[PDB]
Amino acid sequence: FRKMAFPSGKVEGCMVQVTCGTTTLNGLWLDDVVYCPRHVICTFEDMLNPNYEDLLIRKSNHNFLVQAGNVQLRVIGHSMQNCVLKLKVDTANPKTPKYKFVRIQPGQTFSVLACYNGSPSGVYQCAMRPNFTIKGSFLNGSCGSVGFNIDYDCVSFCYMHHMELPTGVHAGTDLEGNFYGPFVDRQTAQAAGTDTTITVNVLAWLYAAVINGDRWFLNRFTTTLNDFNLVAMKYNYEPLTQDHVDILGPLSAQTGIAVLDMCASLKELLQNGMNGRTILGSALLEDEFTPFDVVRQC
Amino acid sequence: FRKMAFPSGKVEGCMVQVTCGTTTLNGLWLDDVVYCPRHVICTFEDMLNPNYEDLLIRKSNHNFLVQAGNVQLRVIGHSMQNCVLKLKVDTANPKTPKYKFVRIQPGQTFSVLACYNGSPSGVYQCAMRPNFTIKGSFLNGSCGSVGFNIDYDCVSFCYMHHMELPTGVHAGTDLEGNFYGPFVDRQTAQAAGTDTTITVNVLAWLYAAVINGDRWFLNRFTTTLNDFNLVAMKYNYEPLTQDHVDILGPLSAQTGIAVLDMCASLKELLQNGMNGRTILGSALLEDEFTPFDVVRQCS
Ligand SMILES: *[C@@](O)(CO)[C@H](C[C@@H]1CCNC1=O)NC(=O)[C@H](CC(C)C)NC(=O)c1cc2c(OC)cccc2[nH]1
Ligand SMILES: *[C@@](O)(CO)[C@H](C[C@@H]1CCNC1=O)NC(=O)[C@H](CC(C)C)NC(=O)c1cc2c(OC)cccc2[nH]1
């Protein structure tokens, strides 16, 4: 299995740069609105302790430089929604795809298009951790890069990049400007909560193994969801929700293995370990493939 | 530090579907030419042992159905270059990027745009293995998917997809239609030569691990180039040349770790194992980042 990103072209055509003073970052141009992190209005000194509402009072439409490449897009209005700025521009983007804004859950994967000065640099797949960080790859100038999924040519934007934590993981918002996790957009060292293993994705991995004939681990037992959840947490695994059980539905039907039967198999792996055995060639259980990712690859 | 592909937009605009009889696959549309695997002219019967010149002489321009999304492109000429078919069309692709065809060397990386029915599906990074296979992700209908690098707006196409070996690895050609490796476009079970590990790439990746605050595998030892190469070859690693040592220069300077000092770290990793420890989240020594890849991402 490869970590596979979606083709990035539909998002590349939406990337612009936004500058306010010498502060430059990336923006997302959809129809006649450009979305970007609101801290673009801050000076380095203001990022230490910002009052966004006051900083924005001193800004006008003509303080914002929006560029597609080197071509300036005239700003005709501005407003703030949570931690994102919305700049109304006088040109509707002809490359705007069909799109939606969605807020994802821990465990869901998405493609990140890393950008610098409005220019796309690379694309890779990330998973939202239970502690609401992603293990990204971002340098100075990457803020405003976005994460997305594509379903039948509709682009669902789910992430806009804001911050690197002292541990080197990354934090950001949805496209309505609401952070994932307890983080805030100020220049301070912030720490994430202890992370856990993404149980629903480990189960997807086990289904993937069964699909490919690697099924030694299937056991003879079963469990209730509540009993499994209580054991899972003693091993630093996320509890399952009803939504997790339902997104495992297609793989459960494909293999004939009930979701709760697979939970019982995983519970043995957790208690007894693997015993030098491997699954899909690895001694480690993988937790960054969603049930959808397994269906796409298999 | 993550496996990172090039943005695929410039390539997506070039992907089309090519159909001959009941055989369909993907093609690459640049200016007024569509490039695709030549076995699209074969009926599934044919693939068992094709005589390609003999089969192509018997086809007409109108046997080729080329679709760019919903629009049909009219084929007005065709020619064969090794394992690649070149269909001349009456329409120039307005989204043709600046491009070049290159043949890559083992150990080098490229981005793959996996396509089905002329529609792009996914993008990921691959390396050309020393045995000239690639460890990709390709299903039925993926033939004609391409691999590429991008350098300041210019797309260097280096791979066109043709085959999945029984072991699950993949094989293909350059855009002049010459296979990488000893493979042939006939429907047979084909084995590769014994693979080896790309040593310069593992070293580049260890430099990447240090830049992300993992220095655990480092040691106080040193080694000569030849003594390292003796141990490398014993572990089925490719030899490290002096040119490799020079390519590793910048990473050595940013970290202050001499190349042969890093070789001694790798020697210890090979001789003792990683002991249940992980490097950048991997339980295994990773060999599909080039020194260029590491610099581009870390800097
Ligand atoms: C943006 O590009 C800002 O425009 C930048 C992206 C990061 C730079 C390094 N890699 C990245 O992912 N984001 C920041 O610089 C943010 C700015 C905030 C939201 C105003 N700051 C941080 O990510 C940040 C600050 C501090 C810190 O201070 C004190 C101490 C430790 C970590 C840390 N991260
Ligand atoms: C193409 O899409 C063909 O148009 C297809 C891509 C592979 C299918 C599954 N995954 C892929 O990457 N390529 C093939 O089907 C090729 C066609 C040749 C070049 C004419 N054949 C194989 O990949 C192939 C044939 C055989 C085989 O025979 C008998 C036995 C074992 C493996 C095998 N692979």
Numbering used by the authors:
A (entry chain A): 3 to 300
B (entry chain B): 3 to 301
Question: What does the original paper state about this entry?
Answer:
The main protease (M pro) of coronaviruses plays a key role in viral replication, thus serving as a hot target for drug design. M pro is able to process polyproteins to produce several nonstructural proteins (NSPs) necessary for viral replication. The recognition site of coronaviral M pro depends on Gln at the P1 position, and no proteases in humans share a similar cleavage site. PF-00835231 is an inhibitor designed for the main protease of SARS-CoV that emerged in 2003, but its clinical trials were suspended due to the rapid disappearance of the SARS outbreak.
